Amino acid sequence: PKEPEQLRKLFIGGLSFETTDESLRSHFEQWGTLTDCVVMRDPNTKRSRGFGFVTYATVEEVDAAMNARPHKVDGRVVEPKRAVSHLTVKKIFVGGIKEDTEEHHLRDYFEQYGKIEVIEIMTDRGSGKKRGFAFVTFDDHDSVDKIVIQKYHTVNGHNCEVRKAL
Ligand SMILES: COc1cc(CN)cc(OC)c1OC
């Protein structure tokens, strides 16, 4: 059955004030079926508030739209973000990896969410022993947004806790 609507929505900031429901739809329909498409407007003046949202039929379509950034809509580069679960960060905390998880375990798993720039496996300041958690920094926030909405992360056979960092 259908993924929850919240996970199929993209909020689009930075719109041209000339963008309409129709022009936003014509743009974003290139990456999937849109079940909803709205430009937010002032209730009295009807002047655009400069943001809106689109709702796709599937999560894979959201992924396709995000992978097609940057989006220039009606002459202006816009800022799409998945709806909140916005705390826009590029770094995650990964906990529960114990002492046998290495850099390549984290890279092999997380590289499929986005381009990794830093992997930091935490070690004890005094002894050098692994503390059982790590931080991963990506080149872009959408990787993190995809990661933190998953119910489960299994890395090196460990069930991990993953959260947005800083
Ligand atoms: C003004 O822009 C945004 C508005 C909302 C409203 N929920 C959410 C957003 O991101 C999830 C935005 O940034 C694109």
Side-chain angles (χ1 to χ4, degrees):
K2 205 126 172 223
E3 301 100 290
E5 181 181 322
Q6 189 77 354
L7 305 181
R8 291 179 288 107
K9 194 168 350 251
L10 275 180
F11 283 84
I12 314 289
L15 295 179
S16 173
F17 290 4
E18 79 161 44
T19 296
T20 61
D21 290 358
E22 292 74 24
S23 73
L24 187 65
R25 171 176 288 275
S26 290
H27 183 90
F28 279 103
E29 266 175 347
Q30 291 178 72
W31 297 280
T33 297
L34 290 176
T35 67
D36 204 1
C37 184
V38 175
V39 169
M40 300 295 297
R41 292 181 181 285
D42 189 86
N44 296 313
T45 68
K46 309 174 181 263
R47 184 182 313 285
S48 178
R49 285 170 65 181
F51 76 98
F53 69 95
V54 299
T55 306
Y56 285 103
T58 73
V59 170
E60 286 192 2
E61 288 166 335
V62 178
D63 290 353
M66 284 313 274
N67 293 340
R69 287 171 302 149
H71 288 279
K72 190 174 64 63
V73 181
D74 303 321
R76 186 168 281 258
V77 177
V78 301
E79 189 182 41
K81 299 181 181 176
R82 296 175 201 250
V84 294
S85 71
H86 185 276
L87 172 70
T88 313
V89 302
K90 295 190 278 174
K91 189 182 194 185
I92 55 172
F93 163 87
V94 185
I97 68 184
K98 310 294 167 64
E99 297 193 282
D100 58 344
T101 302
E102 302 300 0
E103 178 174 310
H104 71 92
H105 294 115
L106 292 166
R107 173 176 317 271
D108 280 2
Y109 178 73
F110 284 113
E111 72 186 0
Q112 303 198 66
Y113 282 100
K115 170 147 205 345
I116 297 166
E117 298 182 341
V118 184
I119 298 171
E120 189 184 3
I121 295 174
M122 309 305 301
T123 56
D124 187 274
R125 181 166 303 273
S127 71
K129 286 164 163 213
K130 289 197 207 160
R131 291 188 61 202
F133 68 103
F135 294 94
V136 183
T137 300
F138 298 89
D139 79 358
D140 169 84
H141 72 88
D142 194 51
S143 56
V144 174
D145 295 337
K146 286 183 290 181
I147 286 165
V148 302
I149 51 187
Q150 298 285 94
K151 283 206 183 186
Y152 311 105
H153 289 290
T154 306
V155 180
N156 189 30
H158 298 291
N159 221 299
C160 297
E161 175 200 359
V162 182
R163 78 169 164 270
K164 292 189 171 192
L166 178 50

